[PDB]
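P.,

For your records, the input lines for the assembly:
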Amino acid sequence: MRTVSVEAIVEALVAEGALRPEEIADFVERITTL
Amino acid sequence: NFEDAIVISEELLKRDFYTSIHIERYEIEARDTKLGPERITRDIPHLSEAALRDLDEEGVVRIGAEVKPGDILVGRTSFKGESEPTPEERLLRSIFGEKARDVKDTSLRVPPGEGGIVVRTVRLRRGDPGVELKPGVREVVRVYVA
Amino acid sequence: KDRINAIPVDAVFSPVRRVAFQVEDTRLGQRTDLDKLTLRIWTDGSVTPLEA
Amino acid sequence: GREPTYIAQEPVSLETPIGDEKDSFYGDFIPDEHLPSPVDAATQSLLSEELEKALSKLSEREAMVLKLRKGLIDGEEVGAFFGVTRERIRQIENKALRKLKYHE
Amino acid sequence: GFVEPYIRLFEAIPDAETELATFYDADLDTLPPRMFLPSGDLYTPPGPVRLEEIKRKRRVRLVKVSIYRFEHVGLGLAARPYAYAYAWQGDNGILHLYHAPVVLEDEVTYNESYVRLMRAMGHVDAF
Amino acid sequence: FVEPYIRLFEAIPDAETELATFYDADLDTLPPRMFLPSGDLYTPPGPVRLEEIKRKRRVRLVKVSIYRYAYAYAWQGDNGILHLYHAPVVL
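Structure tokens returned:
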């Protein structure tokens, strides 16, 4: 199959200038679980 | 000083007038995983001794050390992905000195851009003494650079 | 850095604070349009103005 | 009111507008870890064949009790026993591995 | 007297307020853990290793590593002393050599399938 | 008998400072402090000459030739002090 790691993808999202580390943080936090 | 450019006397930098302190904040979690728990530790596997000179015995960069983009701030080691393979490996765990699995490097490093000198650290460890750590979050560690 | 905890400081070596020269008209003898170049030097004491 | 102490989760789709409910899709921010995925096939190929080697060189009543308990369906040792005491299975189990680990 | 500089190097590791860690006392009985040279390169031992603790902190320790060679005696193999190297061990058990190993100038056996498996998972040089 | 003293020298802390000036002792000049691995003072029956092998910012590895005869390997700091890695091998 195929692997991946979210910590590096999140830092890339934070660098990309989409939203602030607040919104991306809420995103990763909903990503974690419910 | 074309359109709206400005020209500056080097006397300002000597007198250090236009200097302003700035502090960034770097953060990692020692999350807990299918593979096994991740660990905030100093013995990272494939690291030269020179790359560890500034990390304390726990893996955290020491206070007062200049960190350049690519250095280690907090050392984290996580087990090799793709799972715990029960049929065969579970026997090996009893055969071969148990906990002699494999662990990789997933530390925290000064990003492209830069950092400065480490000025403060924050450990929020298990046995959580008043902290709301997220589900599967084991500890969190912060380093402030200036 | 001498020791591992030292903190390097910016270095302003030049012991010269300000420097001004004055070009004053001096008649002397035959000619009017001669220059009395008198230049003027301030320093912190590490080296004297003459020394500089 | 508490959420206490002491292989199951639900997939999140690949395309979901992140951020300020914008145009990004979530696959867009995933870079990769590696392409070839080595130590898989060349390892299990050694891994499996060097198992059956020692696995058959001691008694089959010894080696297979755990080959298939820890390896075939589940686990246990309250019923590991095909019909002996819960104490002799732990006895022969451990003693089996030990002569299996190193032979004097 | 040739252990003194490596004590100096280990006591130069910065400390941190932590609780103490229980270290992986590898021996001939157990897997030799991953070993690394100061250059970060992986060192592979010819067999198992024995560890002699010189100093320790909360979370790392200085050890004299006695690394052993396997040799054919009887059915399979027994352990002769081969080389020694000073290192520091962490709470993952991994050994961090302060130098390349010092090669030593010059009634218990193990299975062959035992050393078969150590070659497979990679803590043993072949040949 | 020189290689083990190249790894014992490499094991010295790499303190990043200015390159220090080591005192290249000679027949013309004095013999400096010389210390055995135990910390004991060794006094030579004559002056010493040095030959540099390796070189950090703050320390260097030298071969200490002693005349009146013998030699020994040691490291030397910005204070010129020769810390011997072994008692001088008498030729």
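Two observations worth noting. The domain at 1-91 of chain F is CATH 2.30.30.1250 (SH3 type barrels.). The CA atoms of residues 12 and 59 of chain F lie 8 Å apart.

Regards
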